[PDB]
Amino acid sequence: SFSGVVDIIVVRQPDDSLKSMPFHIRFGTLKVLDINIQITVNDKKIEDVFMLMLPEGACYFPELNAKNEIQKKLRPSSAILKKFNLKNGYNKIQFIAESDLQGKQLIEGKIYLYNYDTKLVISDVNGTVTKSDSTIIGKEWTHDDIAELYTNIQKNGYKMVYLSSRPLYFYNYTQGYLKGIIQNGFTMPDGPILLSPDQIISSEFKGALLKDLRRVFPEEVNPIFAGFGNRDTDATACLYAGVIIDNIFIINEQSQVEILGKQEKSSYKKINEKIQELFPRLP
Ligand SMILES: [Mg+2]
């Protein structure tokens, strides 16, 4: 079973509060739950914050409801998040489970802070980064020129956000795969990898995930600027999360990219040649 943390996204609101996507963390070692979880951010222990763990291993933030019952939240309150002292962009986060039977267990992940006016560019992974869409060696072929293109998008002030639909067992493999791609010296820009909630079982999926992401930003901005996919269902998911059809790019197994709005056939190489037109520099 999985041991780790699905990358976490946090957005600062214009009233200075913080909203986050759900925290999905799992301790694989821990077995006999019949346990308190502490947090460190950028190598600084966070005081007065703790999570608890369910029998199946998923962790939560305990939060009282108005009936004075403990509710099990995956999304912490803004006051808790403020205690993280997050920096804009990438932050290191560690969760430490203390058990009297199994001792201290540690997992490490990634937590990103964006502002309310940050613009995101979504990329599917399988078939969109990889060429084709359980036995693996990380040698999946990658469409040509995607690293240079995404590098240049990031350089213009957008943030790449990756989307995986693979079972949670592959989550760490997907992170390693993306960070090892090198193409003509170019690499894939660091960013969070979101995971479809169907793959995180506990107690239309891509569309729900992106609407969740859109909704940690305020309603009066459109935070998802563009999206890269390889199936018609990818396009639908982006449209219902606020992407304009002109900014949805759908690639096939021949690495032909259709720019849906202009009904134009292109490629990552050509899109890169037109980067200032299609991904204009943000101030
Ligand atoms: Mg795909």
Coordinates of C-alpha atoms and ligand atoms in Angstrom, one line a residue:
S1 CA 0.0 0.0 0.0
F2 CA 0.9 3.6 -0.6
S3 CA 3.1 5.7 1.7
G4 CA 3.2 9.4 1.0
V5 CA 1.4 12.7 0.4
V6 CA -0.5 13.8 -2.7
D7 CA 0.8 17.3 -3.6
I8 CA -1.2 19.9 -1.8
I9 CA -2.4 23.2 -3.3
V10 CA -3.2 26.3 -1.1
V11 CA -4.5 29.6 -2.3
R12 CA -4.3 32.9 -0.6
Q13 CA -7.6 34.8 -0.8
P14 CA -7.8 38.6 -1.4
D15 CA -9.1 38.9 2.2
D16 CA -5.8 37.2 3.2
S17 CA -7.5 33.9 4.3
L18 CA -6.2 30.6 3.0
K19 CA -8.1 27.8 1.3
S20 CA -6.7 24.5 0.3
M21 CA -7.5 21.4 -1.7
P22 CA -8.0 18.2 0.4
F23 CA -5.0 16.7 2.1
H24 CA -4.5 13.1 1.0
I25 CA -1.8 11.5 3.1
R26 CA -1.2 7.8 4.0
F27 CA 1.2 6.0 6.3
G28 CA 2.0 2.7 4.6
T29 CA 4.1 1.2 7.5
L30 CA 1.4 1.7 10.1
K31 CA -0.9 -1.3 10.4
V32 CA -2.4 -1.9 13.8
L33 CA -4.2 1.4 14.3
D34 CA -6.2 0.0 17.3
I35 CA -1.7 7.8 16.9
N36 CA -1.2 11.5 16.6
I37 CA 0.2 13.2 13.4
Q38 CA 2.4 16.3 13.7
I39 CA 3.5 18.6 10.8
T40 CA 6.7 20.3 9.8
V41 CA 6.8 22.8 7.0
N42 CA 10.2 23.9 5.5
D43 CA 11.9 22.0 8.3
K44 CA 10.1 24.0 11.1
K45 CA 7.8 22.1 13.4
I46 CA 4.3 23.6 13.4
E47 CA 2.9 24.1 16.9
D48 CA -0.8 23.6 17.8
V49 CA -1.6 21.6 14.6
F50 CA -2.3 17.9 14.5
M51 CA -4.1 15.3 12.4
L52 CA -5.6 12.0 13.4
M53 CA -5.8 8.7 11.5
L54 CA -8.6 6.3 10.5
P55 CA -8.3 2.5 10.8
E56 CA -7.7 2.3 7.0
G57 CA -4.8 4.8 7.3
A58 CA -6.2 8.0 5.9
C59 CA -5.5 11.1 8.0
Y60 CA -7.7 14.0 8.8
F61 CA -8.0 17.3 10.7
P62 CA -10.5 17.0 13.6
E63 CA -12.9 19.9 13.6
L64 CA -15.9 20.5 15.8
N65 CA -19.3 21.1 14.3
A66 CA -22.1 23.2 15.8
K67 CA -23.4 20.2 17.6
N68 CA -20.0 19.8 19.3
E69 CA -19.3 16.6 17.5
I70 CA -15.9 15.9 15.9
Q71 CA -16.0 16.1 12.1
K72 CA -13.2 14.5 10.1
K73 CA -12.0 17.1 7.6
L74 CA -9.5 16.7 4.7
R75 CA -9.4 20.4 4.2
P76 CA -8.0 22.4 7.2
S77 CA -9.3 25.7 8.3
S78 CA -7.6 29.0 7.2
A79 CA -6.4 29.6 10.8
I80 CA -4.5 26.2 10.7
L81 CA -3.1 26.9 7.3
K82 CA -1.8 30.3 8.4
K83 CA 0.2 28.5 11.0
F84 CA 2.2 26.7 8.3
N85 CA 4.0 30.0 7.4
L86 CA 3.9 28.9 3.8
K87 CA 6.1 30.7 1.1
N88 CA 4.8 31.4 -2.3
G89 CA 5.4 28.4 -4.6
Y90 CA 6.8 25.1 -3.5
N91 CA 7.2 24.2 0.2
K92 CA 8.5 21.1 1.9
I93 CA 6.0 19.4 4.2
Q94 CA 6.6 16.4 6.5
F95 CA 4.0 14.4 8.5
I96 CA 5.1 12.5 11.5
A97 CA 2.9 9.8 12.9
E98 CA 3.7 8.8 16.5
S99 CA 2.5 5.3 17.6
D100 CA 3.2 3.6 20.9
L101 CA 3.6 0.3 19.1
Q102 CA 5.4 1.2 15.9
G103 CA 7.2 4.4 17.1
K104 CA 7.6 7.5 14.9
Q105 CA 6.9 7.3 11.2
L106 CA 7.7 10.1 8.7
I107 CA 6.4 10.9 5.2
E108 CA 7.4 13.8 3.1
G109 CA 5.6 15.7 0.4
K110 CA 5.0 19.0 -1.4
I111 CA 2.7 21.8 -0.6
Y112 CA 2.2 24.8 -3.0
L113 CA 1.0 28.3 -2.2
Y114 CA -0.6 30.3 -4.9
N115 CA -2.2 33.8 -4.9
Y116 CA -5.7 34.5 -5.9
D117 CA -4.5 35.9 -9.3
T118 CA -2.2 33.1 -10.2
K119 CA -2.9 31.5 -13.5
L120 CA -2.6 27.8 -13.9
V121 CA -2.0 25.6 -17.0
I122 CA -3.2 22.1 -16.6
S123 CA -1.5 19.1 -18.3
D124 CA -2.7 15.6 -18.3
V125 CA 0.1 13.1 -18.0
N126 CA -0.7 9.8 -19.7
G127 CA -1.0 10.3 -23.5
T128 CA -0.3 14.0 -23.2
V129 CA 3.2 13.9 -21.7
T130 CA 3.7 10.2 -22.4
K131 CA 3.1 9.1 -26.0
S132 CA 0.5 6.3 -25.2
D133 CA -2.5 6.3 -22.9
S134 CA 1.4 -2.2 -13.8
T135 CA 4.9 -3.4 -14.9
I136 CA 7.0 -0.2 -15.5
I137 CA 10.6 0.9 -15.5
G138 CA 10.1 4.7 -16.0
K139 CA 11.1 4.5 -19.7
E140 CA 7.8 5.6 -21.1
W141 CA 8.3 7.5 -24.3
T142 CA 7.6 11.3 -24.1
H143 CA 6.2 13.4 -26.9
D144 CA 8.9 15.5 -28.4
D145 CA 9.4 19.1 -27.4
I146 CA 7.0 19.2 -24.5
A147 CA 9.6 20.1 -21.9
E148 CA 10.8 23.2 -23.8
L149 CA 7.2 24.3 -24.3
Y150 CA 6.2 23.9 -20.7
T151 CA 9.4 25.5 -19.5
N152 CA 8.6 28.6 -21.6
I153 CA 5.0 28.7 -20.3
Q154 CA 6.3 28.7 -16.7
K155 CA 8.9 31.4 -17.6
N156 CA 6.0 33.7 -18.7
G157 CA 4.5 33.5 -15.2
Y158 CA 2.0 30.6 -15.5
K159 CA 2.1 27.6 -13.2
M160 CA 2.1 24.1 -14.6
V161 CA -0.2 21.8 -12.8
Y162 CA -0.2 18.1 -13.8
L163 CA -3.2 15.7 -13.6
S164 CA -2.8 11.9 -13.2
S165 CA -5.6 9.3 -13.4
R166 CA -3.3 6.4 -12.4
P167 CA -4.0 4.4 -9.3
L168 CA -2.4 5.9 -6.1
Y169 CA 0.2 3.1 -6.2
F170 CA 1.8 4.8 -9.2
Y171 CA 1.8 8.4 -7.7
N172 CA 5.4 8.4 -6.6
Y173 CA 6.5 6.8 -9.9
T174 CA 4.7 9.5 -11.8
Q175 CA 6.5 12.2 -9.9
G176 CA 9.9 10.5 -10.6
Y177 CA 9.0 10.1 -14.2
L178 CA 8.2 13.8 -14.7
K179 CA 11.3 15.1 -12.9
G180 CA 13.6 12.8 -14.9
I181 CA 12.5 13.9 -18.3
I182 CA 15.3 15.8 -20.2
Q183 CA 14.8 16.9 -23.8
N184 CA 17.5 18.9 -25.5
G185 CA 18.6 20.1 -22.1
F186 CA 15.1 21.2 -21.1
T187 CA 13.2 19.7 -18.2
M188 CA 9.6 19.6 -17.0
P189 CA 8.8 22.6 -14.7
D190 CA 8.2 21.6 -11.2
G191 CA 4.5 21.7 -10.2
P192 CA 1.9 19.8 -8.3
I193 CA 0.5 16.6 -9.5
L194 CA -3.2 16.3 -8.8
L195 CA -4.8 12.9 -8.5
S196 CA -8.3 12.0 -9.6
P197 CA -10.4 11.4 -6.4
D198 CA -11.6 8.0 -7.8
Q199 CA -8.1 6.7 -7.1
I200 CA -8.1 7.9 -3.5
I201 CA -10.9 5.7 -2.1
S202 CA -11.8 6.3 1.6
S203 CA -14.7 7.3 3.9
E204 CA -16.7 12.9 -14.5
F205 CA -13.9 12.5 -12.0
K206 CA -11.4 14.7 -13.9
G207 CA -14.1 17.3 -14.3
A208 CA -14.9 17.2 -10.5
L209 CA -11.2 17.5 -9.6
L210 CA -10.7 20.6 -11.8
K211 CA -13.9 22.3 -10.5
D212 CA -12.6 21.6 -7.0
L213 CA -9.3 23.3 -8.0
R214 CA -11.1 26.2 -9.6
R215 CA -13.2 26.7 -6.4
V216 CA -10.2 27.3 -4.1
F217 CA -9.9 30.5 -6.1
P218 CA -12.4 33.3 -5.8
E219 CA -15.4 33.3 -8.1
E220 CA -14.5 36.6 -9.8
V221 CA -11.3 35.4 -11.3
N222 CA -10.7 32.6 -13.8
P223 CA -7.6 30.8 -12.5
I224 CA -7.3 28.0 -15.1
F225 CA -5.9 29.6 -18.2
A226 CA -5.3 26.6 -20.4
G227 CA -5.2 22.9 -20.5
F228 CA -3.3 20.1 -22.4
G229 CA -5.0 16.8 -22.9
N230 CA -5.3 13.9 -25.3
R231 CA -9.0 12.8 -25.2
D232 CA -12.2 14.6 -26.0
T233 CA -13.3 14.1 -22.4
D234 CA -10.2 16.1 -21.3
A235 CA -11.6 19.1 -23.3
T236 CA -15.0 18.8 -21.6
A237 CA -13.4 18.7 -18.1
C238 CA -11.5 21.9 -18.9
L239 CA -14.5 23.7 -20.3
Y240 CA -16.6 23.1 -17.3
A241 CA -13.8 24.3 -15.0
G242 CA -13.5 27.7 -16.7
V243 CA -11.0 27.2 -19.6
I244 CA -11.9 28.9 -22.8
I245 CA -12.1 26.6 -25.8
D246 CA -9.4 28.6 -27.5
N247 CA -6.9 27.5 -24.9
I248 CA -7.6 23.7 -24.9
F249 CA -4.9 21.7 -26.7
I250 CA -5.6 18.0 -27.5
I251 CA -2.7 15.8 -28.8
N252 CA -3.0 12.4 -30.5
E253 CA -0.6 9.5 -30.6
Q254 CA 1.1 10.9 -33.7
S255 CA 1.9 14.0 -31.6
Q256 CA -0.4 16.2 -33.7
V257 CA -1.9 18.9 -31.4
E258 CA -5.4 20.2 -32.2
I259 CA -6.0 23.7 -30.8
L260 CA -9.7 23.3 -30.3
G261 CA -10.8 26.9 -30.5
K262 CA -9.1 27.7 -33.8
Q263 CA -9.6 24.1 -35.1
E264 CA -5.9 24.3 -36.0
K265 CA -3.6 21.3 -36.3
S266 CA -0.2 22.0 -34.6
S267 CA 2.5 20.5 -32.4
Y268 CA 4.3 21.3 -29.2
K269 CA 7.2 22.6 -31.3
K270 CA 5.0 25.0 -33.3
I271 CA 3.0 26.1 -30.2
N272 CA 6.3 26.9 -28.6
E273 CA 7.2 29.1 -31.6
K274 CA 4.0 31.1 -30.9
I275 CA 4.3 31.2 -27.1
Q276 CA 4.0 34.9 -26.8
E277 CA 0.8 34.8 -28.8
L278 CA -0.8 31.9 -27.0
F279 CA 0.7 32.2 -23.5
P280 CA 1.4 36.0 -23.2
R281 CA 3.8 37.0 -20.5
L282 CA 2.0 37.9 -17.2
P283 CA 3.1 41.1 -15.3
Ligands
MG1 MG -4.5 11.1 -21.1

